[PDB]
């Protein structure tokens, strides 16, 4: 097997795209691209689509676990919430892409160890006033799971203690940070 088999991923993941159009409805500007369950199939995907820095304003990329949709109305998201990374305008150039690729590697690599199942997916927002990257998790009351994910993520993105990042539930956002790391 060692010689000819693809390296398999624990989960199947689906990459989604959100387009800015504003005439059309949200449920129509959100559209699937492709699914994949191997390392090699992930690179074939990653290598031919555009970088986050080159997307027109208001557009999103999303990687979610197969069967969970990148909207908080979904069963696995509704009690959930998200670790949020806020990027200033200058960080588009320097940090946005390398943070996005690191996020994708955390997800597909299953890097949050015994709380891997709490992770649903991640969303990059390309915006004129400040880009954003969020890892979404399934239950906002799992203090232990939510905390560990945050710390893993900051560590992996390489942020210093100085920087503090917020976790907020989708309820609180529809309607402050429940947790900070």
């Amino acid at each position: 097997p060692e010689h000819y088999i693809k390296h398999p991923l624990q989960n199947r993941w689906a990459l989604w795209f959100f387009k800015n159009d504003k005439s059309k409805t949200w449920q129509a500007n959100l559209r699937l691209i492709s699914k994949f369950d191997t390392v090699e199939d992930f690179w074939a995907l990653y290598n031919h689509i555009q970088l986050s820095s080159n997307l027109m304003p208001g557009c999103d990329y999303s990687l979610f676990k197969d069967g969970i949709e990148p909207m908080w109305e979904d069963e696995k998201n509704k009690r959930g919430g998200r670790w949020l990374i806020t990027l200033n305008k200058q960080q588009r150039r320097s940090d946005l892409d390398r943070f996005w690729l690191e996020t994708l590697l955390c997800l597909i690599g299953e890097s949050f160890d015994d709380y891997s199942d709490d992770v649903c997916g991640a969303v990059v927002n390309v915006r004129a006033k400040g880009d954003k990257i969020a890892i979404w998790t399934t239950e906002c009351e799992n203090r232990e799971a939510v905390t560990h994910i945050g710390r893993v993520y900051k560590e992996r993105l390489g942020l210093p203690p100085k920087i503090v990042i917020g976790y907020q539930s989708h309820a609180d956002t529809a309607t402050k940070n429940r947790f900070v790391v």
């Binding site: 390296h7 390392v39 090699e40 690179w43 690191e102 590697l105 597909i108 690599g109 299953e110 890097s111």
Partner: peptide, 12 residues
Amino acid sequence: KKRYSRLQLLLL
């Protein structure tokens, strides 16, 4: 259960 490090994923 399949786990891969940052280094494993870039190498592959």
